[PDB]
DNA sequence: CAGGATGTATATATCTGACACGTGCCTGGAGACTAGGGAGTAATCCCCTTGGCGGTTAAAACGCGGGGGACAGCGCGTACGTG
DNA sequence: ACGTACGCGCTGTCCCCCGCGTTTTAACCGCCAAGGGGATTACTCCCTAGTCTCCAGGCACGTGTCAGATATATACATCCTG
């Protein structure tokens, strides 16, 4: 027989043991708001990706290329305004691929195709 | 003899001299002809004298006298003859032209 | 199968 | 900073694609988009760092990212 | 800094409209890119033809490759005016 | 009765797919191509003469552009779950690339 | 003067390509449609090709020219001329 | 003094001299260091010593001694990183890499 | 009437890595045009590098930064490890 | 069709931080003068595209069945959007 | 949490494209030529790089009205859900 294992060997769970291992009406029909959300966005230019969660995403990527980098607060923007656009283009292409496949909801099949056809794979 | 700028002598507004010095130092070629920069100054004007034109109209039709980077993104993505010149380039703070496919609309 | 490279070894051997 | 790609939220992607033009976004996108965005930055940064690492600087300044983006073909405007 | 030059144009084509301090950046970043593409193509074009010096004719031919369609017509129509006006004096 | 032993619809094409991808010669017929290029350039500047290779260089690129198109319109036709490609795909696979 | 050559690209020559591409069944409209695309692709390459030929003042479109017009658009070519 | 070719001292096969001129003639910069050519011939000589050994090992498998473009097209598209370097390139007389989508295959 | 080329060199390397194989013309004029492509990207890259940093000249380092951008993946870590091994041998032998 | 509820668009007024103009400044550009090296200009020649000739056969066009995929319809149940 | 629109799987229908003979055709090959234009030199010339000297246009900084952001509070606009 094959027996997995137990990961941790105590009944207390170390919560009670010091130096713990484990303790230190009205509704819109579907879709009608979607379109209202588009015209409210395609008319605006404000950045969509939240900034401070992006800053911490760029830093994490830079580490395994070089250590102790310091980004100018401008060069975190110039990345964001690029990677926002890259995605908005990708989503237009996937929307085209889905309108093609005759369904409305984009899906990872659509993402992967809109990348393969671009040759940017 | 009072000095007259090449840009003013040619009647243009862009700096013939500054374009000329740029053409030399960029290491494009060993020598740059006398008539090369003046021609390139004019070609630079007409490309700004058209993007600033189309964007200039965007301000009026949008009722904001100052041109903000979106008014650029509407001047170029509307015009096909320009869009192909600006195919790959992204404009920061530009947004996207507003459209929705026919199948989506109810 | 009549025309094949069979991809003997891909990773670099410097 | 163990997992920050989980920081780009579900409404973050949903907001983006809403600008893109979609209507209904299937659930598996919200994860799959992160896979694309990640492999985009790993290419843009790895170039931006190299320009930096060359000039001996220790700061990836905007004039670098604009350059790294340019070779990608995704020319960027407004910074230099 | 092509910005003073850009303003002079805008104040000509639109005597009332103003320009934000970010658009100038777009244009100063834009003109430089078009200039680089053209002058870069011009250099490669002289190299193919074994010519040593970039001249007036090299830039004109360099334009008709980049600018699409109607722009190629009026740009080279504008360029020839400048050289003839410059060569007039 | 009377059966000519016709292969199943679908297995001649796969066969000849396996025959062309293996091979490497030129597909678009040489001379009727040359009479096309001479006809296109006759529009942009009259009375040109084409060097021999310069016609070949085109056909070598014009093929490997279309083949790059079909191998990319097919992915669009597989996508709608059907096999037969159709002009509503080459209209797609050219707009995805952005080349339009 | 030359006329009506695009229909010279024979209908099989469209499938013979498409085979090498990797498609199995081809609809009826593709044939008439593909010519429309290939004609667009030549008026691009040939033009850029002609412009160089005009530039050096040489009448004959050099094989080396076409390699350049392609190199500009983004489809480099190897082996012809160099 | 006896002449020792600069391509010998580097140990390279490609010519370092001929490159060192090409950098000057192509107008890539106003001055060219003496380290650039030696370093630039190596990279070239490395890559050209990559496509070949791959092409060769493709030739032997088709039972032909000589290398022909069809072998090169097979050596480059198979490899994942060389293909990414030559992504846009189109090789003359190259043919295609055999690929059939799985949906089309009969059943 | 001389059009200088890399036909001698590519052929010399081919004997190093396949002492039996030989290369046909139409396959050579590919390699003779592949090198002239790479050497026009690498150099053309370390021409903008020097210009950006405002250094006037082009030196080897500017080529490492030029290689590690074009050559994708494992090639970048092998080329520059093959470049330095050359240039180090050169200076030490001069 | 009739009608409330909703969201965006619209008006009036209130600040500001920000772009337009002023002013001083110094650094790049304009003037002026060569020098030789690149560029244009004239035979020439030869080799190399265009052009025609005829056989010939590989291939394109054409014809017909029917076999299978394109497409339309439908039932549905769940993975979506909405709050 | 919920309620329902849609992706999808199934059935059914039919048209249209693949398969394979026939029948027509024009690509191809090889062959000859002619003259056209791209490729040498000679020559001569004139144009831009290089250099020196002087100065004013572009740049940076200062500031100061001011058009745009912002808050608030109507006027229709669509959207359902009968």
Numbering used by the authors:
A (entry chain A): 1 to 24, 38 to 134
B (entry chain G): 12 to 117
C (entry chain M): 50 to 63
D (entry chain B): 22 to 101
E (entry chain H): 33 to 121
F (entry chain E): 35 to 134
G (entry chain F): 21 to 102
H (entry chain C): 12 to 118
Please quote the authors directly.
Histone deacetylases (HDACs) are evolutionally conserved enzymes that remove acetyl modifications from histones and play a central role in epigenetic gene silencing. Yeast Rpd3 is the founding member of class I HDACs, which forms two distinct complexes: the ∼1.2 MDa Rpd3L deacetylating histones at promoter regions, and the ∼0.6 MDa Rpd3S targeting transcribed regions to suppress intragenic transcription initiation. Rpd3S consists of three core proteins: Rpd3, Sin3, and Ume15 along with two dedicated chromatin binding subunits: Eaf3 and Rco1.6 The structures of the yeast Rpd3S complex and its human homolog Sin3B complex have been recently reported. Here, we report the cryo-electron microscopy (cryo-EM) structure of the Rpd3S holoenzyme binding a nucleosome at 3.7 Å resolution.
The resulting Rpd3S–Nucleosome (Rpd3S–Nuc) without any cross-linking interference was directly subjected to cryo-EM analysis. A cryo-EM reconstruction to an average resolution of 3.7 Å was obtained, which enabled de novo model building of the Rpd3S–Nuc complex. Notably, the structure of the Rpd3S complex discloses two copies of Rco1 and two copies of Eaf3. There are four major Rpd3S–Nuc interfaces. Recognition of nucleosomal DNA is mainly achieved by Sin3. Sin3 residues K936, K940, K941, and K1244 within CTD bind the DNA backbone at SHL –2. Meanwhile, the Rpd3/HDAC active site is locked by Sin3 into a fixed position pointing to the SHL –1, facilitating the released H3 tail extending into the catalytic site. The distance between H3A24 to H3P38 is 46 Å. The distance restraint of the dynamic H3 tail (25–37 aa) could only allow the invisible 13 residues in a fully extended conformation. Therefore, in this binding mode, due to distance limitations, the H3K23 and H3K27 extended from SHL –1 cannot approach the Rpd3 catalytic pocket either. An intact H3 tail (1–24 aa), the Eaf3 II MRG, Rco1 II PHD1-SID1, Rco1 I SID1 (379–399 aa), and Rco1 I ABR (50–67 aa) can only be visualized in our structure.
